[PDB]
Amino acid sequence: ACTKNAIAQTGFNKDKYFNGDVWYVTDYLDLEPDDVPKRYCAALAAGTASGKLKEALYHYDPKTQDTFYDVSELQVESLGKYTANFKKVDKNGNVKVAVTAGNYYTFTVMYADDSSALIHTCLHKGNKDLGDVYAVLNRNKDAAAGDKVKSAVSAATLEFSKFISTKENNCAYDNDSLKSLLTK
Ligand code: HEM
Ligand SMILES: [N]
After folding, report:
1. Domain that holds residue 4
2. What S-S linkages are listed for this chain?
């Protein structure tokens, strides 16, 4: 179960974050760890598509090769905090698993600038019991976390030393599919 009410960034700039471009997860912290494997790849695009706030997600387990994409139209709870009912799609946007009550994540942007971000997400999926996941994002898939985002991790009363890096997983991403999925 999730336990955190994450606080959104003061002065969060939604249009800059939701600009249609890709964010890569570089590091993550799962508060209920055996939620998820140690050795993971994830990325997202987020933007407005024909007036609708959207995210597209990609997950890849570099050991098992388990791969999935998702798309959601985000609903606003407050500036920088969203609820996202997702649908699993192939890379081209064809629906594999339709939107369904109880399949949603929340999404809080705790810090962002043009190149980096810190987010909190709480996943709900059927009768699974999942916990809080924090993620450090960068526009550059190879970037080491810099002082702005590491300071934001401390300001959330988290220790960056606990975050697990994605950098040694050979992650390769289809940026084109993430951008195009925003429309789907
Ligand atoms: C970047 C922010 C993230 C968001 C918004 C997010 C969102 C989601 C969503 C919506 C699903 C369900 C997809 C579906 O069934 O169609 C999912 C599943 C999953 N995510 Fe993430 N995720 C994020 C990052 C991560 C990270 C960093 C990991 C690290 C291992 C991770 C591990 C998983 C796993 C293992 C599942 C499968 C859960 C299951 O069905 O048992 N995710 N995530
Ligand atoms: N997740």
Report:
1. 1-184
2. 2-122, 41-171
**Atom 36 of ligand 1 has which residue's CA nearest to it?**
36
Separation of alpha carbons 172 and 14, rounded Å:
27
108: left (phi over 0), alpha (psi -120 to 50) or beta: beta
State how far the Cα of 42 lies from the Cα of 53, in Å rounded to an integer.
20
DSSP the chain: -----PPPPTT--HHHHTEEEEEEEEEEEESSGGGS-SS-EEEEEEEEETTEEEEEEEEE-TTT--EEEEEEEEEEEETTEEEEEEEEE-TT--EEE---TT-EEEEEEEEE-SSEEEEEEEEE-TT----EEEEEEESSTTPPP-HHHHHHHHHTT--GGGPEE-TTS-----HHHHHHHTT-
Q: Establish whether residue 56 lines the binding site of ligand 1, counting it when its CB lies within 6 angstroms of any ligand atom.
A: no
Q: Is 149 touching ligand 1 by the criterion CB < 6 Å?
A: no
For the chain, how many structural domains are there in total? Answer: 1
* Ligand of minimum distance to the alpha carbon of 178: 1
CB atoms near residue 92 (< 10 Å): 10
The protein residue with its alpha carbon nearest to ligand 1, atom 3, reads 121
